[PDB]
Amino acid sequence: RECISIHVGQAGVQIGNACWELYCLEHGIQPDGQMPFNTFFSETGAGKHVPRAVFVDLEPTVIDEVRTGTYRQLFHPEQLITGKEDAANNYARGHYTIGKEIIDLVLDRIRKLADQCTGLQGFSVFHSFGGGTGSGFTSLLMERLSVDYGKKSKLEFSIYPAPQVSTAVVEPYNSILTTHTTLEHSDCAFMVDNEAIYDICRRNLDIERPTYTNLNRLIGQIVSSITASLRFDGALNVDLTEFQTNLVPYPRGHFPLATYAPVISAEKAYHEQLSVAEITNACFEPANQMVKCDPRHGKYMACCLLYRGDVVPKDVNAAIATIKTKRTIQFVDWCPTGFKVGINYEPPTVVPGGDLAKVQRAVCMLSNTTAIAEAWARLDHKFDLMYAKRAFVHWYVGEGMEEGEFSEAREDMAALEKDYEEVGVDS
Amino acid sequence: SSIVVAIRVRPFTSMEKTRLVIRKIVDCVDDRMLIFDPADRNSNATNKFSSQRRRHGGEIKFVFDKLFDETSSQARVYKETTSPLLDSVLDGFNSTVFAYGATGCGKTYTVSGTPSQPGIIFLAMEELFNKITDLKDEKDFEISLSYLEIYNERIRDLLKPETPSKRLVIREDTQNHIKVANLSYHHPNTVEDVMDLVVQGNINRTTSPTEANEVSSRSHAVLQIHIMQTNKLVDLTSQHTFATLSIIDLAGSERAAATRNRGIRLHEGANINRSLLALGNCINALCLNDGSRSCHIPYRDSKLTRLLKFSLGGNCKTVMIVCISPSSSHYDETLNTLKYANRAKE
Amino acid sequence: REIVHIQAGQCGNQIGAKFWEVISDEHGIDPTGSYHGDSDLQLERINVYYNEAAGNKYVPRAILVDLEPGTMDSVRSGPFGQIFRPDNFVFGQSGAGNNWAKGHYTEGAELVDSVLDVVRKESESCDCLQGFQLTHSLGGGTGSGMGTLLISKIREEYPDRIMNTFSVVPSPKVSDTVVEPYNATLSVHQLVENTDETYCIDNEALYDICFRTLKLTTPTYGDLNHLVSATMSGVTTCLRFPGQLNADLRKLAVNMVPFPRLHFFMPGFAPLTSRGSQQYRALTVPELTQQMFDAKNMMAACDPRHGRYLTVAAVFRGRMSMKEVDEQMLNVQNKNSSYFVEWIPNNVKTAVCDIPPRGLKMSATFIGNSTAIQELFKRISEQFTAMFRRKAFLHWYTGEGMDEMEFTEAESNMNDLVSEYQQYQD
Amino acid sequence: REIVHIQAGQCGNQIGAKFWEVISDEHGIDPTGSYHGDSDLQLERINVYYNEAAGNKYVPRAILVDLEPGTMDSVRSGPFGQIFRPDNFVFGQSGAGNNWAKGHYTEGAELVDSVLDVVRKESESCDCLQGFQLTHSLGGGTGSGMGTLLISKIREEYPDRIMNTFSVVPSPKVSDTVVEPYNATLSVHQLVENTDETYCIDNEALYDICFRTLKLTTPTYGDLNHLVSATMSGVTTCLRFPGQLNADLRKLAVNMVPFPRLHFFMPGFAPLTSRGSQQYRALTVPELTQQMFDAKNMMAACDPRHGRYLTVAAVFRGRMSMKEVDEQMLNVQNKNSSYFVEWIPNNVKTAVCDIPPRGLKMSATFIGNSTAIQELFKRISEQFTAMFRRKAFLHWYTGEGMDEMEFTEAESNMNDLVSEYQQYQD
Numbered sequence A: 001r002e003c004i005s006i007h008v009g010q011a012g013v014q015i016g017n018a019c020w021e022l023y024c025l026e027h028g029i030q031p032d033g034q035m036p037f038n039t040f041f042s043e044t045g046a047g048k049h050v051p052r053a054v055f056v057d058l059e060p061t062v063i064d065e066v067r068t069g070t071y072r073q074l075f076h077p078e079q080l081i082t083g084k085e086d087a088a089n090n091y092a093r094g095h096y097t098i099g100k101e102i103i104d105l106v107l108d109r110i111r112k113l114a115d116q117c118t119g120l121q122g123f124s125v126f127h128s129f130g131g132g133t134g135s136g137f138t139s140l141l142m143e144r145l146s147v148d149y150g151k152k153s154k155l156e157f158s159i160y161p162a163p164q165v166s167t168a169v170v171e172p173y174n175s176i177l178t179t180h181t182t183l184e185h186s187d188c189a190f191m192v193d194n195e196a197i198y199d200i201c202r203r204n205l206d207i208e209r210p211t212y213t214n215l216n217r218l219i220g221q222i223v224s225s226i227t228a229s230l231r232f233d234g235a236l237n238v239d240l241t242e243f244q245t246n247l248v249p250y251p252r253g254h255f256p257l258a259t260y261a262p263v264i265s266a267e268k269a270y271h272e273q274l275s276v277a278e279i280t281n282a283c284f285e286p287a288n289q290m291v292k293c294d295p296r297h298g299k300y301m302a303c304c305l306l307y308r309g310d311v312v313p314k315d316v317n318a319a320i321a322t323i324k325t326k327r328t329i330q331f332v333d334w335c336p337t338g339f340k341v342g343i344n345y346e347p348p349t350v351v352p353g354g355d356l357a358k359v360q361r362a363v364c365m366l367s368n369t370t371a372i373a374e375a376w377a378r379l380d381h382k383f384d385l386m387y388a389k390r391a392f393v394h395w396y397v398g399e400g401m402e403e404g405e406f407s408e409a410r411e412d413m414a415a416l417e418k419d420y421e422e423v424g425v426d427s
Numbered sequence B: 001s002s003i004v005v006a007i008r009v010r011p012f013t014s015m016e017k018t019r020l021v022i023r024k025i026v027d028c029v030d031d032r033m034l035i036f037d038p039a040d041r042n043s044n045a046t047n048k049f050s051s052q053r054r055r056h057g058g059e060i061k062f063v064f065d066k067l068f069d070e071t072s073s074q075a076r077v078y079k080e081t082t083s084p085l086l087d088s089v090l091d092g093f094n095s096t097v098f099a100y101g102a103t104g105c106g107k108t109y110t111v112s113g114t115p116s117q118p119g120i121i122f123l124a125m126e127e128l129f130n131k132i133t134d135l136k137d138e139k140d141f142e143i144s145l146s147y148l149e150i151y152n153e154r155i156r157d158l159l160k161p162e163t164p165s166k167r168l169v170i171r172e173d174t175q176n177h178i179k180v181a182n183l184s185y186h187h188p189n190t191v192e193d194v195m196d197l198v199v200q201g202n203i204n205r206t207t208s209p210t211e212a213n214e215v216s217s218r219s220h221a222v223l224q225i226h227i228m229q230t231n232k233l234v235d236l237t238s239q240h241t242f243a244t245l246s247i248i249d250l251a252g253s254e255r256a257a258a259t260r261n262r263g264i265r266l267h268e269g270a271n272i273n274r275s276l277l278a279l280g281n282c283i284n285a286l287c288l289n290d291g292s293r294s295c296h297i298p299y300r301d302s303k304l305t306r307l308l309k310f311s312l313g314g315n316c317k318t319v320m321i322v323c324i325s326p327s328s329s330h331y332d333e334t335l336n337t338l339k340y341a342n343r344a345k346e
Numbered sequence C, D: 001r002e003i004v005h006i007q008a009g010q011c012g013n014q015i016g017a018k019f020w021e022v023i024s025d026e027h028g029i030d031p032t033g034s035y036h037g038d039s040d041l042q043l044e045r046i047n048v049y050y051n052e053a054a055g056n057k058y059v060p061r062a063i064l065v066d067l068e069p070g071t072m073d074s075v076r077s078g079p080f081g082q083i084f085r086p087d088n089f090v091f092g093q094s095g096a097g098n099n100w101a102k103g104h105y106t107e108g109a110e111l112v113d114s115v116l117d118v119v120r121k122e123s124e125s126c127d128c129l130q131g132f133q134l135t136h137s138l139g140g141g142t143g144s145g146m147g148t149l150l151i152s153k154i155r156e157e158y159p160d161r162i163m164n165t166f167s168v169v170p171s172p173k174v175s176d177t178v179v180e181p182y183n184a185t186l187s188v189h190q191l192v193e194n195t196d197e198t199y200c201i202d203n204e205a206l207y208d209i210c211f212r213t214l215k216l217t218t219p220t221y222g223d224l225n226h227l228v229s230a231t232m233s234g235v236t237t238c239l240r241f242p243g244q245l246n247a248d249l250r251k252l253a254v255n256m257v258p259f260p261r262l263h264f265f266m267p268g269f270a271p272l273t274s275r276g277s278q279q280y281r282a283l284t285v286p287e288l289t290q291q292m293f294d295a296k297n298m299m300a301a302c303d304p305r306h307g308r309y310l311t312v313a314a315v316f317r318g319r320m321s322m323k324e325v326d327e328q329m330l331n332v333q334n335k336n337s338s339y340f341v342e343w344i345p346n347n348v349k350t351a352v353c354d355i356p357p358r359g360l361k362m363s364a365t366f367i368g369n370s371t372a373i374q375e376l377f378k379r380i381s382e383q384f385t386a387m388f389r390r391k392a393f394l395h396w397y398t399g400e401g402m403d404e405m406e407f408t409e410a411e412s413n414m415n416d417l418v419s420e421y422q423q424y425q426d
Ligand SMILES: CC(=O)O[C@H]1C(=O)[C@@]2(C)[C@H]([C@H](OC(=O)c3ccccc3)[C@]3(O)C[C@H](OC(=O)[C@H](O)[C@@H](NC(=O)c4ccccc4)c4ccccc4)C(C)=C1C3(C)C)[C@]1(OC(C)=O)CO[C@@H]1C[C@@H]2O
Pocket: C021, C022, C023, C025, C026, C214, C222, C223, C224, C226, C227, C229, C230, C231, C233, C234, C271, C272, C273, C274, C275, C278, C357, C358, C359, C360
């Protein structure tokens, strides 16, 4: 029942920081690993349990922050893999010249972890699409990892190149090149828009000035509910492969949206009275989508609802019945139902120094929909435009990345878009 | 005006014949009509239902101006395409011959091959020389030969590497005259000596010592024939013009990253791909801007594009040549270079 | 990693001297080379610009090149004579005298090896060489001659490393030589071909900024160089400490050059305000971007609003909201959609570092790849042409072995540069 | 929300200086810009008129425009030189010299952008711009020239925002220029077309008030401007704190302009009494309305009782009974039914704010849209005509490129204004 986490570039690492902070909080584990859970922490005889994680950055910077900051004592030094020269927002360099120089070490460290791990369920990769050290390197690693562990589940939690705003101008390229690897090798991928989150921080948490710290904490909190939640023994312990069983209808379509519906400020925690139906209803409102997408313009393929803390199955069922009664949101016509429920007994995790106020229960939604496919069209336009001018193409050609690879990457993305169109239309 | 795209393959040998269990990816079904095989009926998956695949299930149709195959002899393939280019040179404007492919795909072999067969350079001189001696009684022939290699973005004197690259500067005139600095220029006294210099050049070319192609030229080269014929008669219009024929060669390019791609292999590999990009930029700009009204072409991307500033772009004609492999071991490379040729066509 | 800083000519040396003042102060380094800073992050990447000599003496990873002894003397006599290493002081025969051919082709060429030997010595003291930074003028003669001379030589040694330069551009109304076009044209001819990124700074533009915004009664060269040094630091400051979004010379190039050759940038710096007006500052990200995208605060003479933005880098300093920054970037591109090149989806590349410049609560620096810069090239080309048509002053270069062909070739190639920028402007 | 205050010309600047004294005092702001008030409501809407700079320094959302350096100097040398922001001090070439064409058409036109840039900077520091307030004279030349010049420019930028102005009107018996009609006529010609509301204040009327009611031995400009500033505050005071009935520039316009073009208002102020007579005051709503509807307390020279009231705004300050106020409004309209325009059912718009002017127990301000004001326009038009018939002084504007057609067109259009007010009077 154990798993391995992987972190790349800067984003994957920073997100990881939030995740491992949460896990420590959940299990009472100290910054030096001391406990005063074995699926995240390798058992240590001294009590200093150590994270099952691989950290990669071709420019140690963010890892040095970890090495010098808190939880430097938590993580094992062998896990903190760094390079010398960064990929620098170039998928091709991360994929090849630079990334390939450490990929051997990376795989060796993974192997050690996998040899230590008895009941390995799968992996959880944290990456972006912007940087090459995230995008390109992950592409390399996932291919290699897929070969070694064809029977293990590969989760990818990605930071989706936001449609409204971004920070690098060559993102479209790195994003589209990643797509044909993730779609090929991953078992389930998640796409998260920073801008959608910032918007959530503004509206729900009432934050005028939001940053990566709080943003990442929300993302990590979702992952806790997806994974760690199961490992606390609830009423309905839905397996990670059980998620796939019910969420995924085809060989493809590995793109669920992960939302969190108890997002709430400390002030609201006093006035607001939440419950099962209230929170469940909130997660189907085109506001907490965690991505620039409006479900109301597509259909629901599948929807897993994960509950934590003080919930009962009766109310959950009733809320779902109400949703199906509402009939505002559309479901795939050839999918009789699409609702699956996971239930914990353990409460929601609270971050000291956070904002997300303490609640008695929580809901996460993992939903497959045809609406999300529209987001790729926006990326297609961005790509097509820059591609038409071959802008920045020489940075990938300088690596040796075949021009035709870009056209192939697009076609694979377009295929994916087409599949979702067929799902919604056909009956 | 408009350019011509022509294509041909190496062959398959006992190395491919031994491999009984393989499906070919190249199938020329007619003249100018290439079908990319084989779709997808694989036993390594399913695919026993209405296809939801992007292209893995269909066939890719490539249409060119003159597609050839292993059946057609280079004696015809060359002349069919370049006999008019040679004549074009003498129509008041210059011309040029291109090539394309991955390393080991028949460049070096197709320009000449085993020393008993015809090829690009041999037939160029064979045909021209016959025309020279037939027309020697009408016009005076002052023809010269320019030799050139490109390696690490550096211009080398193909025949005399003893001269430093600083002594080679690529310029062009407003008359489209080829202005290259101190270079060992020679004359086409006979094809034997011409080809001997070509061999001397190929010896001097700086090669790979890595892959199975370890002769592997790994450098570009351009051989330019500068024809300055003059009149034997005196009259009011007696002003015979001049023009040239560029023979373009490329290093060859392997998959984005090879299993031992280190150091100088990365460095030159980048320089090769950058040079190929530069050609792609200029070719695509040229063709698209011929469709449009204004032609701004990025001739400064490479020294080759400076070298071809007018050979590729002026009031002239050229043929694109691409070498194709029928093996699935070159599936991506061949397919991508086919698309390249088609984009160059349009 | 480590970066080599080479200074060439009086101009470049004076700018560099101010630069090393700034970053030594930034990293807590006193005039002995000893570290007495208050942070630990000052030593986290001190290796980038300093050798750690026995006794913890931090020694500028820099090479001081000049052909006019006396300027080099003023460096040794200055506060950093105890800082710079003596074998990095490279000088000999008297200077070019605004003669590019003397600087590049002949007299300077004789002393190339004395520089390159030091380059090698510096390289082999490094754990990972990232690239080179050259500081020089574009018309001085020695700085512009030795500049492109050394650039060529260095790239031959390190073809895969980053060639960065900060070049002071001939300004319309600020002169001091009548062959400024000859030297600039001959220089840029070789600059483009052998450079990965170059920054164009006009003394005239700085003269305007240092009064219009800083209200200086007597703007001196030490103040103009100070403005330059601020932006020089910003370019690489991201490499020397933690930040929300990292950045790099390579990263910038990847996001700043869309077309190989178009790697000329305009530099700018945020909070520009006089000491009596600082009390009226809001010190907000909005405020900073108002200044960063203000044409009047650009250190190139050409006003960006006559062209378009191929791509922009906005590197911020200090604690701030990532959303706040992103919002402002969006507002800017929405505000002037006609200025930004539509071929790019997100026209602005951003980066945010956790540490503001000591004494500032929050700052930033601006790097613009605009098409407007073509106009500076045009102006210079016209001046060059006018003289060249009469072969004016040509004998000064003829006597060094320079022919006419070089000059016509250079200009032809300068026209290509302008044409390319115009190609990508509507 | 936020409102921009622009001052134009010496007159406008002196009035504005007094205005900012008043409201800074109202909101507890000292001469450093620091807040030391006793209420919390002083900071509730401080953003309306102040930027909050680092250190809590509150900076007038105002632009200081003049063409005569020296007046601007007196502002900087005054108590608010530490208050106003230095980049809001816009001045250059010497002033028009009572030449409207210099102020609007030529010399002033050259410096428009230097104002508008500041306007934009102010706009982008706002969360929600409501409108603009212009303070100027109607005959000065620069204040009247730059006035309508900037009004046109600003509306082009912000056509949907509120254009408010406080204009000092040429007074029958109080002069200082013989081209007062030329400047006024040329000004109002453009004023009407581009203004949403304008207030007409006569120095003569104030000269009368400041003696008749305030018994001042030596009424100075600082005292006349003081009277003006009181009413200026009242117009927008409702926006800056709580009240039983809110009010607004828009709200007023909606209830004060019945016919698009007729947006000229007479201003007044309640408790007007000398310091020896204040002890005899009742301080009741009745008393206040007796003063507010007293023709002698109107700050326009024209006596309202020669015309009719199209609509009246009565804005009250401090704790009071809503019924008491309503009763008095009824009594007034019943008392002088012949004065009020019968076409309107309730001729008086009221508002009541919870906070009186510091030091007063209860106050109010009066805004009247009367038809009587037409007589001021007539008088000026007649003076203009008499001169214009001889083309007197015309060469001063001819030399600036102004033709006769403008002058005849302006007067024709001035006649329309008067005619319209007469149309709506019996
Ligand atoms: C009391 C106080 O806050 O003083 C400020 C100050 O008044 C102002 C006006 C500073 C001042 O800068 C100048 O007046 C200036 C002089 C010549 C050329 C350019 C600028 C200041 O001198 C500059 C100084 O800058 C720094 O300390 C930065 O770390 C800066 N350092 C240097 O440039 C430097 C100067 C001397 C010796 C060593 C370094 C820096 C900026 C970017 C990257 C690295 C370092 C600061 C904040 C101030 C003073 C001291 C008055 C300003 O400039 C900078 C670069 O910060 C000018 O507009 C800004 C706004 C600041 O508020």
